[PDB]
Amino acid sequence: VKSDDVNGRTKMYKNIVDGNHQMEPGMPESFNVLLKEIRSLGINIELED
């Protein structure tokens, strides 16, 4: 939430001023950068479900 989560920062900046101190993790943009920097290397790395 603090460092890099585009849907986490803009959510908790509204949650705090609202009155409730909640959290939503999202997933860091740096990981979405590492995924691209490995996918563009000819190596297919994905996530299961």
């Binding site: 705090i16 009155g19 101190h21 920097e37």
Partner: protein, 313 residues
């Protein structure tokens, strides 16, 4: 751009830089208890900005976020009163730069002060390995409710007394308090007030403050030595023990459970650490935090009266 100390795996994924941070130089901060640390106002105002906005909205002072921002930048009288609310029970993490081991990053309860330096309880200036020759600590803030509760139930400076490497305590009195206690617990073979009989420590402190008796003097006093020999019960025994005025004054600071065979010797440094360890072992944690906080006050106060200076002779 993947491997090495510059790659993602060690620069942008593990060590993400964080918001709600800060930095400043260190100061002695002696008065604050070991569960609280100083904080400049001009820093705590910027750290807790969203909380201030929310509290202003609750008060109705600001209709929108824009007005709240304007009044925060005004730094008027109302904003400080609001800041003294969101700071009440909100721990912050005082993090040293090269945190080698677990005790490097601890929690503290803020106490707003003027100036521009972060204060620090002296007894925790050993676990940090933090000097005062211009060192720089970084202040972080926990935001979520779980984080606030965690920085209270695990990270408060009163929660990690014993280091994880070994059972020995990590808040051992370090430089001035130990010298003051050592100068307190001694004996000169001839000082004014030698061989007298004293009613108790309540009277010894008065007989020393008046100047009628020197700090070191072999005398005879009576002491209520409390014993925990009965399981869960405190047995009170009182015997006319022979000791110095300085040692007798030191008796009132120690809790009741501990015996009298600890504050009677010369009281170097290892003796003080062992005294703290025994207090923790046989009295718990709550009556050891108070004892370790009171011992620093006594040590400083009686190392200031000593005038322990170094001269060529």
């Amino acid at each position: 751009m993947i491997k090495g100390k510059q790659g993602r795996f060690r620069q942008n994924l593990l060590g993400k830089r964080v918001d709600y941070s800060g930095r400043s130089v260190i100061t002695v901060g002696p008065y604050l208890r070991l569960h609280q640390c100083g904080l400049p106002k001009k820093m705590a105002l910027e750290l807790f900005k969203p909380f201030i906005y929310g509290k202003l909205e609750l008060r109705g002072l600001a209709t929108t976020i824009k007005a709240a921002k304007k009044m925060v930048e005004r730094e008027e009288a109302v904003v400080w009163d609001i800041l003294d609310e969101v700071i009440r029970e909100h721990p912050v993490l005082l993090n040293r730069a090269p945190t080698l081991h677990r005790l490097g990053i601890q929690a503290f309860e803020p106490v707003l002060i003027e100036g521009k330096a972060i204060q620090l309880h002296p007894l925790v200036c050993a676990a940090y390995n933090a000097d005062f020759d211009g060192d720089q600590m970084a202040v972080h803030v926990p935001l979520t409710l779980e984080a606030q509760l965690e920085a209270r139930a695990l990270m408060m400076s009163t929660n990690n007394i014993l280091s994880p490497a070994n059972g020995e305590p990590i808040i051992v009195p370090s430089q001035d308090v130990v010298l003051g206690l050592y100068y307190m617990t001694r004996d000169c073979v001839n000082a004014k007030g030698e061989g007298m009989v004293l009613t108790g420590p309540k009277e010894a402190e008065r007989l020393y403050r008046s100047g009628l008796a020197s700090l070191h003097a072999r005398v005879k006093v009576r002491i209520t030595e409390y014993e925990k020999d009965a399981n869960g019960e405190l047995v009170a025994k009182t015997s006319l023990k022979d000791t110095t005025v300085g040692r007798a004054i030191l008796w009132m600071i120690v809790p009741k459970g501990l015996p009298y065979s600890i504050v009677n010797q010369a009281l170097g440094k290892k003796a003080i650490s062992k005294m703290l360890n025994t207090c923790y072992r046989i009295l718990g944690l709550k009556p050891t935090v108070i004892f370790a906080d009171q011992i620093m006050y006594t040590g400083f106060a009686y190392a200031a009266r000593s005038g322990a200076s170094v001269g060529i002779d």
